[PDB]
């Protein structure tokens, strides 16, 4: 299928209407970031030749 980018949402704009929230939600979300790699070393002579 041809993918859909998202649901249509026509915001009810006018020149004298405002939307004010009457409530709120406390949202907690995760963000995962890699920090470090595995530290490796090579004995180059031993790898190439043994």
């Amino acid at each position: 299928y041809t993918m859909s980018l998202g649901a249509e949402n026509s915001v009810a704009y006018s020149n004298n209407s405002i939307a004010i929230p009457t409530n709120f939600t406390i949202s907690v979300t995760t963000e995962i970031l890699p920090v470090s790699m595995t530290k490796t070393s090579v004995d180059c002579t031993m790898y190439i030749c043994g």
């Binding site: 070393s41 004995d43 031993m46 043994g50």
Partner: protein, 50 residues
């Protein structure tokens, strides 16, 4: 099949037709002794960086 390593007793049970053993990286880590049919575990000699 020659190499350098530390030969130690092993709990691995080879099938009777197998002689050598390899790990996921295809390096010989276990060998069956041809004289006495006992499986010997090969550990590389403990190298390191100074």
């Amino acid at each position: 099949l020659t190499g350098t390593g530390v030969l130690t007793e092993s709990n691995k049970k080879f099938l009777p037709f197998q002689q050598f053993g390899r790990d996921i990286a295809d390096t010989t880590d276990a060998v069956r002794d041809p004289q006495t049919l006992e499986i010997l575990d090969i550990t590389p000699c403990s190298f390191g960086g100074v």
